[PDB]
Design a protein around this ligand. Structure first.
Ligand SMILES: [Zn+2]
Ligand SMILES: [Zn+2]
Ligand SMILES: [Zn+2]
Length: 88
DNA sequence: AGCGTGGGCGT
DNA sequence: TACGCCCACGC
């Protein structure tokens, strides 16, 4: 409920609860990409986004569709959420 | 459909 | 701070 870390970049009103969350957000302004994929050498701003990117090189799809006669696999949870909502 | 990526909130 | 997971938007 309290977010004292405010971004003072031009025309930005973002506020955050912790210093790292501010630093993470500020990477969208600066374009800094500290993390690099060891397979394709592409650089990314965040490590968690790098992790899911690597699954494009391995084909790993940990999230499976729970419909018995389907069972499509997906790399990220949000891909499975959209798929499950589609079966409706 | 597949995925970059910005944000919420956690350990 | 490191590290991560989920959710959602926009290609
Ligand atoms: Zn900002
Ligand atoms: Zn890569
Ligand atoms: Zn399915």
């Amino acid at each position: 409920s309290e977010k004292p870390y405010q971004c003072d970049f031009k025309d930005c009103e973002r506020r955050f609860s912790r210093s790292d969350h501010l630093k993470r957000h500020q990477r969208r302004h600066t374009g800094v990409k500290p993390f690099q994929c060891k397979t394709c050498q592409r650089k990314f701003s965040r490590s968690d986004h790098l992790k899911t990117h690597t699954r494009t090189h391995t084909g790993e799809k940990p999230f499976s569709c729970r419909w018995p006669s389907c069972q499509k696999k997906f790399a990220r949870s949000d891909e499975l959420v959209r798929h499950h909502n589609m079966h409706q």
